[PDB]
Each structure stands twice: as structure tokens, then as C-alpha cells.
Amino acid sequence: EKLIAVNRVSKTVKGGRIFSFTALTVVFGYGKAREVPAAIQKAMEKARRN
Amino acid sequence: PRRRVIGQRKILPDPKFGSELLAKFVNILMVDGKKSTAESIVYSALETLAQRSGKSELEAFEVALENVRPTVEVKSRRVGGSTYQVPVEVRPVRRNALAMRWIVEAARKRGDKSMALRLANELSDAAENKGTAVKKREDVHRMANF
Amino acid sequence: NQYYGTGRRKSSAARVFIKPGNGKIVINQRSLEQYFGRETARMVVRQPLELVDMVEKLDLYITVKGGGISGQAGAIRHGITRALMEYDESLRSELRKAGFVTRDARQVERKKVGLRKARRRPQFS
Amino acid sequence: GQKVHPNGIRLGIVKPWNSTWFANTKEFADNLDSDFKVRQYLTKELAKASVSRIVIERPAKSIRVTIHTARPGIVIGKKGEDVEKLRKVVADIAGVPAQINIAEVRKPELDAKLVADSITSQLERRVMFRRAMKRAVQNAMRLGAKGIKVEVSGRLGGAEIARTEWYREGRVPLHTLRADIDYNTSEAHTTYGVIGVKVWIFKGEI
Amino acid sequence: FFVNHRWLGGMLTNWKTVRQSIKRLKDLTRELEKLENSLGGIKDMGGLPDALHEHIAIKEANNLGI
Amino acid sequence: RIRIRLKAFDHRLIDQATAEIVETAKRAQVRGPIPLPTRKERFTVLISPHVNKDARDQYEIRTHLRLVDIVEPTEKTVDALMRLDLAAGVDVQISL
Amino acid sequence: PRSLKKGPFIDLHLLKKVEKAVESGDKKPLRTWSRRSTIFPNMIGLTIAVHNGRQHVPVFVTDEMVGHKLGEFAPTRTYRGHAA
Amino acid sequence: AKQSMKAREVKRVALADKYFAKRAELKAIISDVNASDEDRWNAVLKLQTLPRDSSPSRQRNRCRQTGRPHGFLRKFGLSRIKVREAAMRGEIPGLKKASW
Amino acid sequence: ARIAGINIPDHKHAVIALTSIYGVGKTRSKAILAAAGIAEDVKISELSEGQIDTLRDEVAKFVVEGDLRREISMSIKRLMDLGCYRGLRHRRGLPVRGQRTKTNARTRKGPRKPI
RNA sequence: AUUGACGGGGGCCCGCACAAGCGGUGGAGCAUGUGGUUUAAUUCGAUGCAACGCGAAGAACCUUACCUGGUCUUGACAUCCACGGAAGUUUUCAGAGAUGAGAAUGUGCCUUCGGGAACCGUGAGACAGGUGCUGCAUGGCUGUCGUCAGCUCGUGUUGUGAAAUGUUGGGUUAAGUCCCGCAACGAGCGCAACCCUUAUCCUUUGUUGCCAGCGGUCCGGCCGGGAACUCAAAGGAGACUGCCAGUGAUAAACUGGAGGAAGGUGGGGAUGACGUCAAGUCAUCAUGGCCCUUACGACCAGGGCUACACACGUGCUACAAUGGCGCAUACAAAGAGAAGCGACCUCGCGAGAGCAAGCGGACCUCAUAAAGUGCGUCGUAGUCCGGAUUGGAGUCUGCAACUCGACUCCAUGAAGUCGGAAUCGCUAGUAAUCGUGGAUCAGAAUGCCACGGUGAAUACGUUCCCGGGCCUUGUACACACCGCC
Ligand SMILES: CN(C)[C@@H]1C(O)=C(C(N)=O)C(=O)[C@@]2(O)C(O)=C3C(=O)c4c(O)cccc4[C@@](C)(O)[C@H]3C[C@@H]12
Ligand SMILES: [K+]
Ligand SMILES: [K+]
Ligand SMILES: [K+]
Ligand SMILES: [K+]
Ligand SMILES: [K+]
Ligand SMILES: [K+]
Ligand SMILES: [K+]
Ligand SMILES: [K+]
Ligand SMILES: [K+]
Ligand SMILES: [K+]
Ligand SMILES: [K+]
Ligand SMILES: [K+]
Ligand SMILES: [Mg+2]
Ligand SMILES: [Mg+2]
Ligand SMILES: [Mg+2]
Ligand SMILES: [Mg+2]
Ligand SMILES: [Mg+2]
Ligand SMILES: [Mg+2]
Ligand SMILES: [Mg+2]
Ligand SMILES: [Mg+2]
Ligand SMILES: [Mg+2]
Ligand SMILES: [Mg+2]
Ligand SMILES: [Mg+2]
Ligand SMILES: [Mg+2]
Ligand SMILES: [Mg+2]
Ligand SMILES: [Mg+2]
Ligand SMILES: [Mg+2]
Ligand SMILES: [Mg+2]
Ligand SMILES: [Mg+2]
Ligand SMILES: [Mg+2]
Ligand SMILES: [Mg+2]
Ligand SMILES: [Mg+2]
Ligand SMILES: [Mg+2]
Ligand SMILES: [Mg+2]
Ligand SMILES: [Mg+2]
Ligand SMILES: [Mg+2]
Ligand SMILES: [Mg+2]
Ligand SMILES: [Mg+2]
Ligand SMILES: [Mg+2]
Ligand SMILES: [Mg+2]
Ligand SMILES: [Mg+2]
Ligand SMILES: [Mg+2]
Ligand SMILES: [Mg+2]
């Protein structure tokens, strides 16, 4: 299994900025989550089906 | 208010005569919850307004109210930035309310010694179109210009 | 027999005993006129008997404690209304319509932290 | 916003008091101070013995202390050796005849104080804060908590800027008064200062 | 087996979640009718079925190969 | 005649304690338990360490109070009532 | 003021100094911190240097001062006007 | 509170207890309607000479946990802050949040 | 009419009229009239010249008017000459009885003096 | 192009936000906090809303952190070590006291007569000590938007992607409240409910509370009694849009009606989502780092925190006749009390004093409710309004009321005749007004927290002002319009 990059993305809210993480994995899969570990899992899950 | 669901509270009739009109009048005269004080003023004033009229206390009260009750008054409305003074019809409850308020306000700044006498004199003057209460009604009518 | 009713208003509670008679009213071992100075108080007490037309058909023995002059007058009215309904249950509809059967549950609202009173807030600059 | 103490708001609804004695004003303050010194002593002495809660009762001219413990064997000791030491010190502190009773905490992973103490112990051993928090949550939900929240606040990982992090699983309905919310706290004294831990464990209504 | 009212977007692509409403209907009057007017003809299906306006249902069927 | 006043911070606790007494003594005619007025002692505290004067907590201790009177009491009664054991957190007070 | 039933207050240390000063003859100033002590008749003619927080202010005792406290004659605050 | 400030209070409580009977004896003479003016005067001068810290009015109630000299509650012997902390942990018997 | 070298009001009740005298308040006024044997609610106009003589004798038992002003002047002068704290407060025209001066003190200081 | 935020863009809504009202503040005197100035010191902190009767629920000494001066150096507060002392207790002198120096009396307890420790020195030196600094290193606790109705996640699906959907829409609600539709299906935290209190009833128990009917009286529930009633406090019952009609989408719900003590969240409280402001607090406490150590630590007396050309905030008392004064006389609730509450009686004009019951309280005490009502008087005056200020004389607490207490008596009798621009609170047992209690506390409230009494006016409405919610739209904003330029 092959993670390629991890990007930190941001959306702005009333309070400030919600930072979140993206994970690109071929085994392709593009995951999104609040944490890096969760993002990679979602990516790897998607890369199996796709 | 915005939700505008305001009903009205059960006014008890005045104990002596049995008028809700006069009960409201006592409430408008009353200060600091001292209803017993206000009742004695109103009834003292009415007794004098009877012996200086030759009629029932409430008949003479009615005559005074007749001459003070407004029919029309102005209301401010924001249209264009510069705020107009717009005449509208006064509904009959507000007519009685303003008249009583004006009579009480008139009587309070009169120069007689007791409030009972000040009030009797205001109602006497009102019942023949003279004092400051009827001047307020006339002033309101002058302003009432859309 | 005696017909009984408890009445309450603000912090007053009244005990009202009614028997066939001719318009005696005793409140705390005193006449109505002696006990209550105010006409409003006396009117309030007599309102139920005036409504049902039994002012000089009934003797009232009353005791009352707590609250003030208006509280106690209101408590007595409620008590008389209940005693009447024990005497004659047909009177309920008329007494209900007059608003005498309701226990007025308005009480003093508590003082609250940061307020001068129950609702009066300190002045803001 | 600030939140009401979950234990405090449920006292008498679904949570018992940890001190159950009667006193008039005369003895009230003195009893609170003796209770304070008893709990201070026992918390010091039984730091390694997984103490969740110390219930104090004062029947007559006496003190009865119940220690809720996940490791009862070492509190009690060797045919009641360690417990007899504690009793004699508790009687000295309290100034009345003492009785120490021992209640076992089965399922220490569902005990908010022990979970909080477990996390703060790990943080003082320089364990990564996220891993301590996640394991606590996972353990509680495995043994049948209807929910758990864990919060850690301070200089996490020795960061200069302090921050709060929290994780929840399941239900933690704090506004529901009949909810059995077990709540407790702990402090990790690290080389970069204090890290506070808060644990909420929900175990069902009533 | 049949879906004869509204096809719920994710009926089969999100089968795992719609199964929890199957379990919910099975255990259990208005929450009933709302489920028996929807998931009442997939309650014994047990998994991804054999074969089947319904652009959504066809699209889900193509994703899985049903 | 033995007046027994019970006090407790918990009404469930005191009602159990009185039930233990009256049971023991009714095996002597007792009177009660009489529920005397609960004392509500109240405390208002500032909850901030500094300033914020309008932020307070209000706390209460309720002291529940019962009276039981034991009449024509026997040697068994004075004994049975002392070999009795009430729960902790219930203050008991006898008067002869 | 102090109840008449209790008599006038004087610090014992000051009383003993004054009594010794009076019997010895005309003294240097008596140094005291007892601002709260009442001035008695036997103090008339003595200088009592009374503390004001930072220095002992000389107070030559007269008959009119009798019954006052010593601190009345040694002001503790310094004020000479704003905007000087 | 500083350790010294807590130590000052311990000294005050000790001295007050040591001299309680003596102080009451002297104040009884000074309050006595029928005492000699010599006896009252001697008693006034004697009461001065005892340590000032033997007067109970010199004691400031302090929180028994922190030594805080403000916000004290006599019932609990604690400051407002420590009362709250103990109250919420269920350590003050009977005490709960009040509403009415 | 004339008591203590001042004109007392003739229309007023005796108890109120005597309080025109400096040194006579309500308590002393009532005591004067009790001693003189005159009712409080009698007007000064209604009293006989013998009754005004009795009031003059009763008023002569107190320090009033010019004698009292002299006593009060001398008491303040004593303090100011003593150089006591109260004396210094009198000289400076500030409150003498421990009142705050950061604010208020307007009775002693008078109207505000703009900076 | 996306998510926000913002718009003197649009649509729809809400809140004493405005309007309608009632009473205030702003003027006066005083109380109190703050700024400033002053000072030896006027200890430190809180600063737009969200600091300014705030931390402080109570600074004469103490408290006390500050100043002046006098003093101590392993030490006021711990542990360890060694040696010599039982510890205590009575007292004298010098000293402002800290403290220094003497006198005198104790000599126990455990005790394998090996002893040790309860407790005192004194001598080391590891240490103690710090209300010293950093709240922008932190924990904990708190304010705030706001009790506003929001804030999210999993999985699915959509988009290259930031992200979106769900959460929007049609209705409806106090409410993302509920219904219906819908590429979403579900879920979590919030809403609501569960908790406390108040309004009605029932059961149980019946003294210290109760007195309807008896019997008796000293006419006082006072006494025998009674267990009815008030009440006490445990347990129950009761309200659900449940019933009826109309309306509505065959919905949710809405409008009205019945019954009912109560009606649509019945009234009030507790309860404060994700987050925001490097918001507040290193002086409650705790704590990283830094810093001081014969001093930034410690002890003492006296002073200061109470200063006063002045400015601001929060209050109290007024300016009177709906009132003042005098006499007479009704009706509360809630609470506190043993180094405490203190009756009766006697003394005092009074604050109080003396004597001395009762009460750890439904029993005794605080403890007079006041406004009210009746009668009388004053007669519109700077007054019989107001009660500041000052003189004199006292009382009490307290080692001690000079700086700097509260209260009393006699005397004094200021400003003030309803307050400019502006501005605040309140929608009902509310506002307004009237007393009552409590915490802190030796003493020291006009503050704070709580309790009853009397008891209003007004709301057409949502155009406008302030804060906020939802949808949509433009943006060169993202330190987010207090922006960018
Ligand atoms: C004085 N005033 C109350 C200021 C203010 O208005 C603030 C605000 N958010 O409105 C602050 O943050 C303000 O209150 C505040 O907290 C400030 C700070 O915390 C700091 C700190 O800690 C260190 C350096 C600088 C600052 C600061 C400039 O941001 C401070 C400004 C403060
Ligand atoms: K005069
Ligand atoms: K001053
Ligand atoms: K903080
Ligand atoms: K999603
Ligand atoms: K620090
Ligand atoms: K004030
Ligand atoms: K003001
Ligand atoms: K006057
Ligand atoms: K003083
Ligand atoms: K004003
Ligand atoms: K006090
Ligand atoms: K917009
Ligand atoms: Mg009130
Ligand atoms: Mg305030
Ligand atoms: Mg004096
Ligand atoms: Mg410390
Ligand atoms: Mg003190
Ligand atoms: Mg003062
Ligand atoms: Mg308005
Ligand atoms: Mg003003
Ligand atoms: Mg600081
Ligand atoms: Mg300051
Ligand atoms: Mg700061
Ligand atoms: Mg700011
Ligand atoms: Mg001081
Ligand atoms: Mg000496
Ligand atoms: Mg901060
Ligand atoms: Mg949203
Ligand atoms: Mg919801
Ligand atoms: Mg939807
Ligand atoms: Mg209805
Ligand atoms: Mg809720
Ligand atoms: Mg800051
Ligand atoms: Mg000092
Ligand atoms: Mg100050
Ligand atoms: Mg007057
Ligand atoms: Mg008290
Ligand atoms: Mg009590
Ligand atoms: Mg006077
Ligand atoms: Mg003038
Ligand atoms: Mg409202
Ligand atoms: Mg008041
Ligand atoms: Mg909404």
C-alpha cells in the first residue's frame, strides 16, 4: 500500500479556522478527516474498492 | 410586542359606585401601590363634583371625560428618513385612557391645596371646557397635518 | 350542620364555616366592619353571598391567618365560595363564571442574584 | 461557556455523597477538616493501589472509612497488615476509634477517577497524549459504557501554546439529571507544567 | 424483494446503515408506518440483492453490479 | 415518657430510622412520628476566583426532623430501644 | 468616646515615664508611640515627642490639651495643596 | 496565604487560650459597678500588659485549607472557593445546589 | 411677641414659635411650655402679657441667641488655637468628623472650584 | 472557484430592541467604588459592552500584602543531625514592642532500671521562606456572545479539488420544535423532558402546631379533651393539546370552547452546546520557567489603605399636603441563636445599664412589621418640608475608637422647590412603594443575599435604534469593514 502525500486543508468558520487533513493512497483513494491517521484509513479503504 | 398576543386584565369595579371606568381612574391616580389613598381622593373629588353640579357623581365624571376625550392623534412614521407626524383615529378604550391620564396630570400641577380639591376643580373646569386637560385635547387636535 | 371551606390567597389561609342564619359574619372574633377597614376588602368578602343572593340567609364564622388585608379578604372569598359549593353544589357554575372558584396562584416572585428585585436590574452606564 | 460540575448537580438525584454524617454547626467545620486530612493521608499512602473514592461516615464518636479500590489485596496487605497501619493513622488524625472497610472496584476502566489517574500517570511517563486518551475511550466502550468523554488540557507534547483536546464515544447527556454520569479529574505534573484531565463516563439513565 | 415507495439514496451503496433501520423496524405505530411504507420489502434480504424516475436506484445498482 | 428527636440531612434515612424505632417500641403505645419543620440553611458564594460579582452558586442543607413519644414504657422498651442500631447520619436525642 | 465608667485610657509605659519625668524635674522630650494615650494634668509642662508614623513631633502640653489624645497633636498625613 | 500569616494565627489562638481566664477576670473588675476606683484602674493597667495577641478580636478567620482571609464561611471553616470544590465532590454532607 | 431679644411669630402655635429662638429646638420648646404652664397648640397672639413674661423667665434658664453663638464661636476658636486635628480641619474648611473628602464634602468645601 | 465574515444588498424572523406606558439616572446633600492628584506610604488586582457598592460575605489594632523606624539570620513555618535540658507554670526589671536579662516552681509518661517521645533550647547545613515576575509558559475556576438555537460526526453520494449534501425546501414551533418532501441514511452535543419550588386535592402521623363540636373556666386553646380544620412533611393524585368545534396538505400544528385549583413550556428557579475574546485570575489554591536568600524571607510598634483643586460610575435621602407631626389601632413572610439569642423586672430622656428566666428551639429569644386605618393638627412657606454640617454631652464593643467606629441626647438646621443634552429599568403579583431577616462580623451596611405587605400603567404595531437567528446575493475583505486601499 502506497500513501503519496498528506495535505492540511482549512475551512473558515465564525470562530476561526477548522484545519483538517487529506491523504492520497494507491494500493486510488483520497481520504479526508480531522486527523492524519483517520484520513489515511479512509483513503486506503477507498483505494481497495476503486 | 412582535408576537402580539396581549389580552387584558380583570379590572374590578370601584367598590362605592360599581364602575370599571372609575376603577381605572383610581389606578391612574394611584402612586406606589397606595390604592386606598387614591380611592379616598377620587371619592372626595366626586362628592364635591356632585354638590357643585346637582347630578350623580358618575354623570358629572362622564361630562368631564366627554370634553377631554381625543378623537384623533398623531403617530410618528419613518418614511424617507424624515419622520412624518401622521393622524390616526383613537379607539374608544384609548380615548378614555388618555382623557383620565390628562385629567390626572392636569390636576397634579394645579395650585389648590389637596389633590381631592385639585381633582374636583379639574373635572369642574373640564365639564365646561376650560382647564389644562381640555387644552391638551385641543393641542392634540391642532397637531392632527398624511 | 356547618358547611366548611378553606380559602387561600398570597400567604393567607382562611377557614370558613357556614350555617343557616341571617347575615352574621365573624372574622377572628370580630365583625367584618371591625376586622376590615377598607370597603374593597368588605366588598370582596361579601361578593359570593351577593352573587348567590344569600347575604341575610347564612351565618359565617371565619378565621384567617397570614398575608395582609387584601390577601386575607381574597382568602376569605375563596373560602366562602367553597363553603357555598358544599352547601349547594348547583351554585358552582355561577361562582365559577364570576371567577371566585379559582385559587389565584399569583405569589411574590423571588429576589434573584445580580438583580435589585425579582426583575429590576441595576442601572447600566 | 462554563459547565456545572456533573457530580455536584446530581447529588441526591442519582449520585450519593462521599461524606454521610450529621453534625450541628459546632462540630461541622471540625469534621470537614478531619475528613480532609483523612482523605489527604489515604490518597498519599494508597497512590499505587488504584483508589477511586473514599467514603467517610461518622457513626457516634467514631469514623468509618470505606476505600473504593481496584487493587484491594495490597490495600489490605498480608493477613490485614497494611490496613491496620492505615486504621491507626486514621484514628490519630480523626481523634476517634476508626474502622477501615474496603470495597472492590470491578471494571476500573469504567471508573472516572481511575481512568483519569491512568491517563495522568501515562502523561508523566511522557506517553503520547492522544494514545492515552484513545485507549481510555476504547477500553470503557469495550466493557460496556454507554458513553465516555475524555478531555486533556495544557502544554500537550510540551507545546509552548497550551490547548484542550477531547474525544467522545457514545452518549454523554450532561443536561439529563437522571443520567448516571461518573465524572472525575486528575492533574499530570510534567516538566512543562500541569496538564489537566477530565473524564465523563455515562452508564445509563438512573 | 421490492422497493415500492421512495428509494432512499444509499439503500444499497450505504446498505450497512439502512440495515440498522431494518433492525429497527424488526424490533418494533407511526415509526412503524414510516418504515413499512419504505423498507418493508427488504427486511429479509440480508445483503446485496440479486436483481431489481429510479435514476438513483439504477445508479446504485451499477456501482455494485446489481 | 421518652421523647426521641431524630435529625438527618436525608429524609429517606430519617423515615427508615423512625420506622425502626416505632416497630421496636410498638412490640408501649408510641405517638408519631411527628414531622416537625425542616430547616433550610442556605449559602450564596461567588464562583469566580476573582471579580464577576454576579456569578454565584446557591447551596442548601436541609435538616429533617422527627419526634416520637413512647408512653407507658416498659423495661423491655428502654432496653429494646438501646440494643437497637440506627443508620449513621441520623442524630438521635432522648428526653425523659 | 471611651465610657466614663472605664476611666480615661493611658498606656502604662507612658504613665510611668511621665511620673518619673515629673518627679525628676524638667526633662528632654519624652519619646512615645502612644498616640492613643489621654493627656493627663500631670503632663502639663512636659514636651512629649509623639510619633506620626515617621517622626516624633514635639508636643508641649498645656492645660487646654488635657483630656485629648496625644495623636490629635501629631498629624499623620502631609498635604500642601493640589496644583502647587 | 503565606506560611508566616498562617503561623501568626496559630500563635493568636494559643495566646488567647492561655490568657482567657485572666483577661475575663480583669475585664470583670473593669466592668464591676461596685469595684474600687483603685481596683478598676489597676485592672485597666494590667489588661494592657498582657500580649495583644491574647485578645480574641486579633484572630482573623482563615480558610482551613488555603489560609484565605476573605470569603470565609463559619459553618464549613472554609473560603467560598474551597466550599464549592468540596460541595461538588459530595464531601460536604447534606449540601446541594439550591433552587426555589 | 419679644422673647430673648427676637420677634417670635404670632400666628404660629407656641411650640413652633419658640423654635425661632437660637438654642431652642422642639424638645426645649415643649419643656419651656410645660414649665410655663402654656399649652403647645396656643397661638402666641392668643397669649396674655403675663404669659409672655412666664415664657421669658423659662427661656432665661437656657443659653440662647447671642450668648450661645459666643459659646460656639469660642469652642471652635479653642480647637483652632489648640492646633489639634479637629482645629486643623476647622482652619482648612474640611470635614471634622472623619467623613470622606475624595468625593462629597460639599457642605464644608462649598461649590466645586474648576481646575 | 470554496468556506467564512462583511454590505448605507434582498427576503423572512426574534429579544423591554424600539413603539405604548410607569418609575428613575443626569441637577442637590450624603454613602460607596474608580480615575486623577497628593503622599513616607496612600498595598496589589479588576478597564468598552463583559472594570468602577468589582476580588473585599464587612481595613481602628489585627486583617495587611504598603510606609517609617526598631530588630532576626537554618530562621515565623517543616524534616533530618548532635548535644544539653520534662514540658509547663508563677513572676520582676529594661524596652514602644519585638526582645533581652534575672528570680521561682515543676521533673512526669513509655520504661527488656538498654530505654526511648510528648515538648524545649542551642550549634551546624542540606534546606525552609517569597501576596517576588510572567494569566502571552499552565491547571483549576470564572465572565462573555447567550439559555441565543445552534454546532457537528459516521457511512453513503456529489465535486479535479478547497468543499457540498445531510442541516436546504413547503408548512409549523419558545426551540435544527414537529410534520411533509428530499441523495441521503442515521447519530452525537445542544432544545425538550427527568431535578427544586409554587398553585389544587387525597392518605398517613398529630407536638412544641391546631380548636370545629363538647364539658369547664381565672375568658387566655387557659384547662379536660378532640383529630375535625389551619399547619407541619412524608407518600400519592393532577395537565396530556387528553376531550369538543373550526381550520389545516387525509400532516404537524393553530384558533376557540368545555371541564378543571391550574391550559397549551401554568408561574419561578437550577440547568449554559461546538466555540469566541492569547477575555479575567501566578494575590484563593496549584504549577513550568525566571528571580531574591544576614533578604524580595521573618518579628515588632506607630503610620497608611479613610489623603482631596478635581472628573466619572453605582446607590441612599430629599425637595413635601397622594405629605410632615402627634395620639390611637389592624394585618406578614422568611430567617438566626451557646465565648450565642437574651425575656420579665428595676434604673436611665435615650443609646444603654443592673439583675436574671427560657432556649441548641413549631416550645425560649431576637421580635415593634411598616406602609395601612381612625382622630387631631400644620395650610403651601425654603415651611411643623429636608436633615447635610458643626458645637456640647454621652453609650457600647474592643488591650485601644486622635488619625479612623457605630449609636444616643441637647443644640445647630446646609443644599435642595422635581433636575440641560443625554441616558437606565421594568410586560404582572412585574414596576413602584413599604417594612423584615441573613451571611461576613468583637464592633463596624445606604452594599450584597433573601423575605413577605400594598400594588399599577401600557403593548396599535415592527418603519426606526441596539443585539441576534435563518435563507439568498455582491466582495479587490481572511489581522476578516475597528477590513482593504
Ligand atoms: C488593555 N486592554 C484591556 C486590551 C484589550 O482590549 C484586549 C482585548 N482582546 O480586547 C486584550 O486582549 C487585553 O485585555 C489583553 O489581555 C492583552 C494581553 O493578554 C497581552 C499580553 O498578555 C502580552 C502582550 C500584549 C497583550 C495585549 C496587547 O494583547 C493585551 C491587550 C488588552
Ligand atoms: K431654634
Ligand atoms: K477621611
Ligand atoms: K486560565
Ligand atoms: K459526509
Ligand atoms: K509561577
Ligand atoms: K449607597
Ligand atoms: K447617582
Ligand atoms: K425644618
Ligand atoms: K476609629
Ligand atoms: K435626578
Ligand atoms: K459585627
Ligand atoms: K449576507
Ligand atoms: Mg417585594
Ligand atoms: Mg452590584
Ligand atoms: Mg463626641
Ligand atoms: Mg504557600
Ligand atoms: Mg476581625
Ligand atoms: Mg467613615
Ligand atoms: Mg420607549
Ligand atoms: Mg447626582
Ligand atoms: Mg500581580
Ligand atoms: Mg486601586
Ligand atoms: Mg491583568
Ligand atoms: Mg479590548
Ligand atoms: Mg493596619
Ligand atoms: Mg516595660
Ligand atoms: Mg488569558
Ligand atoms: Mg447550521
Ligand atoms: Mg433536536
Ligand atoms: Mg431534511
Ligand atoms: Mg380554555
Ligand atoms: Mg433543558
Ligand atoms: Mg490577557
Ligand atoms: Mg502593624
Ligand atoms: Mg479602599
Ligand atoms: Mg422635619
Ligand atoms: Mg446575624
Ligand atoms: Mg430555627
Ligand atoms: Mg435634635
Ligand atoms: Mg437655596
Ligand atoms: Mg419579557
Ligand atoms: Mg428596602
Ligand atoms: Mg431558526
Author numbering:
A (entry chain E): 13 to 39, 48 to 70
B (entry chain G): 2 to 145, 148, 151
C (entry chain I): 4 to 128
D (entry chain C): 2 to 207
E (entry chain B): 90 to 117, 138 to 161, 168 to 181
F (entry chain J): 5 to 31, 34 to 102
G (entry chain S): 2 to 85
H (entry chain N): 2 to 101
Could you pull the original sentences from the published paper?
The improved resolution enables a precise description of antibiotic–ribosome interactions, encompassing solvent networks that mediate multiple additional interactions between the drugs and their target. To ensure homogeneity of the antibiotic–ribosome complexes, which is important for obtaining high resolution, we used highly purified in vitro reassociated Escherichia coli 70S ribosomes, to which each cocktail of antibiotics was added.
In addition to direct hydrogen bond interactions, we also observed indirect interactions mediated via magnesium ions for tetracycline and a putative potassium ion for hygromycin B. For tetracycline, the primary magnesium ion (Mg1) is fully coordinated by six oxygen atoms, three from the nucleotides within h33 of the 16S rRNA, two from rings B and C of tetracycline and one from a well-defined water molecule. The secondary magnesium ion (Mg2) is also coordinated by six oxygen atoms, two from ring A of tetracycline and four from water molecules, which are within hydrogen bonding distance to U965 within h31 of the 16S rRNA. However, the ratio between backbone and nucleobase interactions varies, ranging from 31% (four from 13) for avilamycin to 83% (10 from 12) for spectinomycin. The exceptions are (1) streptomycin, which does not make any nucleobase-specific interactions, but instead forms 14 hydrogen bonds with the rRNA backbone of nucleotides located in helices h2 and h18, and (2) tetracycline, which forms at least six direct hydrogen bonds to the backbone of nucleotides in h34, and the only sequence specific interaction is a stacking interaction with C1054, thus explaining the broad spectrum of activity of these classes. The high quality of the structures enables a precise description of direct hydrogen bond interactions between the drug and the ribosome, but also indirect interactions that are mediated by resolved water molecules and ions.
